[PDB]
RNA sequence: UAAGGAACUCGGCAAAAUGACCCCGUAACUUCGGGAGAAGGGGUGCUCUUAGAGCCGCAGUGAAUAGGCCCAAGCGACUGUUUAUCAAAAACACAGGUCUCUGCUAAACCGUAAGGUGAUGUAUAGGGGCUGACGCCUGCCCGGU
RNA sequence: UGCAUUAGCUAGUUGGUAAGGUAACGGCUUACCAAGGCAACGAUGCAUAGCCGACCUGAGAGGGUGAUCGGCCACACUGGAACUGAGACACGGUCCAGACUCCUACGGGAGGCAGCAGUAGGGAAUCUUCCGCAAUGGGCGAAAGCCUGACGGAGCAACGCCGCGUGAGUGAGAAGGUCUUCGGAUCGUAAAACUCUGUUAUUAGGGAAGAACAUAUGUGUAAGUAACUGUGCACAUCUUGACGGUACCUAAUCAGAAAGCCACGGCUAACUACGUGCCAGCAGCCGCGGUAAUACGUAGGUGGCAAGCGUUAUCCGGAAUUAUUGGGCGUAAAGCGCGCGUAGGCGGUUUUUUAAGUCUGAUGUGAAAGCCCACGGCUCAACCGUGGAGGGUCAUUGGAAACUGGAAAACUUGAGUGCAGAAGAGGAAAGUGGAAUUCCAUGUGUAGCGGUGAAAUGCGCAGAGAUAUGGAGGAACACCAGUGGCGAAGGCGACUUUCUGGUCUGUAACUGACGCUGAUGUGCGAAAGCGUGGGGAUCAAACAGGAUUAGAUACCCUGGUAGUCCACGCCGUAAACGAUGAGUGCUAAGUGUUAGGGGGCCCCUUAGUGCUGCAGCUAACGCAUUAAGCACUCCGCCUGGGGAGUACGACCGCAAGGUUGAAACUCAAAGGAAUUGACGGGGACCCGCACAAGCGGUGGAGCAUGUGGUUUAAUUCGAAGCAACGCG
RNA sequence: UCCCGGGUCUUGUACACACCGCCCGUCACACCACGAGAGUUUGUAACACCCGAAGCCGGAGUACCGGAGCUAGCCGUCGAAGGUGGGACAAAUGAUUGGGGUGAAGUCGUAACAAGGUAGCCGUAUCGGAAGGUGCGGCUGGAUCACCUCCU
RNA sequence: GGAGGUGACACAUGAUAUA
RNA sequence: UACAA
């Protein structure tokens, strides 16, 4: 069944960002908001609207394209894992791509990038690379 | 695998395996029993020496039976042109396997213990136990 | 019965040794039952206290009665039977196997017959031949009889 | 640390009470009571091993090692004890037992280098039976001092590291060597010649530090004293060096004493000649050598290093070749034949709470030496010293609360239930039926039937085969029938009844995460096979005969037993295959088909089952919403080929065998997909005196001629299937 | 149609020194390692029993006040070593024996690779000098030619 | 046109490297 | 070609 609910929303991402879709819904869960919300800040994904409705809620996100039909998001990967958990320190905190992707960090100041982790000095459970 | 998996049976890597075992060996002979020491040379004796021909090649292959210090029995090559050797020879025997002769894995020292250098070698004598000329 | 201990002898024949009860402990092989009492070892008297403390002898199941054991091979599976009176066995029997005869007034057997056995049974039964537990198996020849 | 091809271990054992015992708690010991304790999170047994700081390697993650220096432990010929003592169950103590060695005058006595040297032995291999207590440290002493194989030094060894030499400047193509396309080229500015230097070397002259002291002798001061002596502290005087006349410095003389080792086909820097002729030899791999060898041996030249240079052995790297970082499993090695299910692993949404994981500070600790950075002393450098940094999965303590975990409470999407429909060779049992095969009987009826490439064996005139009717019996179910259906897989196909399993669609009553996977385990599992008992038509291992063939233990023919069938047990294996594990989600289309549903034959929609085909993936072939795409969870499996699914052990089995499963040794491949050819007793088309249709010859005779073989002094040499032989 | 040879396209191939190709197994030869094997030898460790040292525990002689104390000795429990016994395990070797690897192609055939001349392979059974044959079930990882479903 | 299902006499041998 | 027979 159904294991791991991040890594099939990153996964979603991946295959609707493979075929240039404009949009994609999922179900929503409270993270995922959270990863969506960064996703649109850090300018990878253009908007996120969250449906409400009887069972979980549905989250709506929309793609980015450039000049070229050229995708925004190149990948996505899941670091920590329900097989096996991934945490860093501030000190030790990944840099993506030289600096040019992110890493989404859930702390416990809530879930944020690793470029602001490093800011506050804080570490947690390394959710995945967006680059 | 899984992590699980690994962590339920760890990954084991293949054991390396000697080219000249007879040489990583020893004898107590108080105990009558085997060591394990990593010799780079052993003294041995000549049993039979003699000729053999070798696997594409023809030669007559020049190579002799060694009763090792550790009791155990070994075909050594004699390398260079003639040699000294006959049965109740005391010879130095060191590692390396000549090809083309099957079940010679070891080399006889030129110039150890009672083995001759090559006579009439000028180039590469130290090989072939040979002292400097003049 | 000194010392020896199978040197005796066709052959340890005969004799010696073992031997009861109680407690430890027990191999190959096996048809899983066995083998087994395997083997090999410990304890036994008497008095006193309530398992200990003592006492005596060379010796305590102090007499008599009471398995010797082990390793390996042939034959026969086994208990049983036999030459009364020189042979007890490897011979006979055996459970098991197979072949064959027999439809019942059966076949087979006794008897001249009547009358009987088979059987007050009926083919999962009865008679005869060969083989002989069990395991794996049981090849070729139908020319002759 | 290995091994599960080691699964059971323990009976003072585990707990209790009491006493004893110890520096001390305690089954530490004993007595009595109870039956506990350990183990798949690996007990126990076997094997191996002193452990760490460190060291080697590596980008790191890791892998490998414990010599030297430091910490800890253990041991002192082997085993058992105790004594003295603060401390030992004591290396150079005792007692006892044992092995061994030595003295004896046979009563008796003696000994323990794993201290430093040294000897013998073993070994490929590892040093002097040296000097001194001057320094540091230790024991004893009031001290002087004594003792100290600790230690400080010297000796031997290129064993390693670092440093410096073996000359420098100028010097146009000498001789000699080697090669030569005999012009020359190269060794080569190299040599000689001219000058210069003395690191080193030899001879001589000087010559440190390392030494601090202690004692003693004076003064001063502090405490104390009634006071002194003494004691503590301070200053001043005194003696003391194994190394050693060493380091170092100064002067003189001389290029004179001081270069070797490996390599040169490619990897890989550096080529020629001669000798050799698959020999001799070389070799890490590819491989080299069989008469023109850059690969063998030598020579010249060159390259790489240099007081070293090579070889062997061993470890890490390269090796992503055990892959956490960082690999795989359709066809290359690799998905268990398939279910059910235990432990374990993993697990949907939200709120509150907690604080084990996670994060973030504080404190303590992680010795010294080492590594790395900085600085200082050694003429430099090695090396030495000093100051930092680093290294924990460490502990204790204060905070944070997103995620994982724990608690509580909600939720309905997952998963189940209910209700309403539907399809099905799903399974088990018992009945009914039609065709055909074989056999049997009867009637007609006569000469073969049968079989093959051709035959023969075989059956038949005693009436076959054919034909018609009837009977017996076993086995199997035409048509329907379809990349159709059902089942986990194996599998399931006439019809009827009975018993029974699962799936699909719709609905949204209900429960409220109840789920996924699944080691061990437990079951099912084609065919053959095995046991007991039945049955026996057809077919048919074995077998027989007949053919074929050089042979034919085959293929073909005629028969034919087990078996094929049933029941009940066993066996547990198949190319048990989609050669593709299960679960979940996401990612173009087109088009068949099976079972449904909704709406207006079509459109939409579920769940299966096929074909084609994007993105993506792939070594390619191909896969592609039924993935081999993109992801997460769990399980199984792989790590070159052979040996070998073998051996040994173990478990299972009546047996056949099954499951688990190595190594020695050997090779440099084995292998996958695709490509160009060739070939096929593959296919299609086509052609040639190729066959067919014809005519005339050769092979037989004599002779001519060429060849072979024999001869010979010579019978010259060349040509050898077509394509040598009236050929040059 | 057939014998020899050649051309085009296609198909299978384990061939490329290209079918005068490749290649399998028995038997014979030489070396090597390994298993089995009537047996023989050695080592470890436990167990049980017997004996049992020094030591542990218990039960005549010589500062205090003839006595106390003490020592010597004697007895039993525990005690290393040793001996006895039967097993477990491990290593060595053993007439003979089995299969394997490698070397060389000696011998017999020709099993596989082409439809390899009977398609091959898997399991199983049985037979045979050998490769192998045959039966039953399975697979396509089978060539050539048919009749149908599907796709283009 | 391309797939998937379905069905359909005899002929022995040729050493090693180097190619 | 060098071999093998
Ligand atoms: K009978
Ligand atoms: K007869
Ligand atoms: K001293
Ligand atoms: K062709
Ligand atoms: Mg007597
Ligand atoms: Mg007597
Ligand atoms: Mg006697
Ligand atoms: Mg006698
Ligand atoms: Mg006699
Ligand atoms: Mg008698
Ligand atoms: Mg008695
Ligand atoms: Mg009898
Ligand atoms: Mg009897
Ligand atoms: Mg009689
Ligand atoms: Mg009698
Ligand atoms: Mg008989
Ligand atoms: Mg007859
Ligand atoms: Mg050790
Ligand atoms: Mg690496
Ligand atoms: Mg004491
Ligand atoms: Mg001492
Ligand atoms: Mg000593
Ligand atoms: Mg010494
Ligand atoms: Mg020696
Ligand atoms: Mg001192
Ligand atoms: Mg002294
Ligand atoms: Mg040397
Ligand atoms: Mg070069
Ligand atoms: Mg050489
Ligand atoms: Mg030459
Ligand atoms: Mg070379
Ligand atoms: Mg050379
Ligand atoms: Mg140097
Ligand atoms: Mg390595
Ligand atoms: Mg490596
Ligand atoms: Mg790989
Ligand atoms: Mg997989
Ligand atoms: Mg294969
Ligand atoms: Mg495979
Ligand atoms: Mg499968
Ligand atoms: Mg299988
Ligand atoms: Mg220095
Ligand atoms: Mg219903
Ligand atoms: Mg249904
Ligand atoms: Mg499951
Ligand atoms: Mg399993
Ligand atoms: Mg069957
Ligand atoms: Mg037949
Ligand atoms: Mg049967
Ligand atoms: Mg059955
Ligand atoms: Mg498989
Ligand atoms: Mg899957
Ligand atoms: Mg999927
Ligand atoms: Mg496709
Ligand atoms: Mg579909
Ligand atoms: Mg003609
Ligand atoms: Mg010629
Ligand atoms: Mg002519
Ligand atoms: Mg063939
Ligand atoms: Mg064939
Ligand atoms: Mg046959
Ligand atoms: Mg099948």
Request: aromatic letters at 4%.
């Amino acid at each position: 069944t159904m294991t791991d609910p991040i890594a099939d929303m990153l996964t979603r991402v991946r295959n609707a960002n493979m075929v240039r879709h404009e949009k994609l819904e999922l179900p929503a869960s409270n993270i995922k908001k959270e990863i969506a919300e960064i996703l649109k800040s850090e300018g990878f994904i253009k908007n996120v609207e969250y449906v409400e409705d009887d069972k979980q809620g549905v989250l709506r996100l929309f793609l980015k394209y450039g000049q070229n039909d050229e995708r925004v998001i190149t990948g996505l990967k899941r670091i920590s894992k329900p097989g096996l958990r991934v945490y860093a320190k501030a000190s030790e905190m990944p840099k993506v791509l030289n600096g040019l992707g992110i890493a989404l960090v859930s702390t416990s100041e809530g879930v944020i990038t690793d470029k602001e982790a490093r800011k506050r000095n804080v570490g947690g459970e390394i959710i995945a690379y967006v680059w | 695998p899984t992590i699980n998996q690994l962590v339920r049976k760890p990954r084991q890597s293949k054991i390396k395996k000697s080219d000249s075992p007879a040489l990583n060996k020893g004898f107590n002979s108080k105990k009558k029993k085997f060591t394990d020491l990593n010799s780079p040379q052993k003294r041995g004796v000549c049993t039979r020496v003699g000729t053999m021909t070798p696997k594409p090649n023809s030669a007559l292959r020049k190579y002799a039976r060694v009763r090792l210090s550790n009791n155990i029995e070994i075909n050594a090559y004699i390398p260079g042109i003639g040699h000294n050797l006959q049965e109740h020879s005391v010879v130095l025997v060191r590692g390396g396997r000549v090809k083309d002769l099957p079940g010679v894995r070891y080399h006889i020292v030129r110039g150890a213990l009672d083995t001759s250098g090559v006579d009439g070698r000028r180039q590469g004598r130290s090989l072939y136990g040979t002292k400097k000329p003049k």
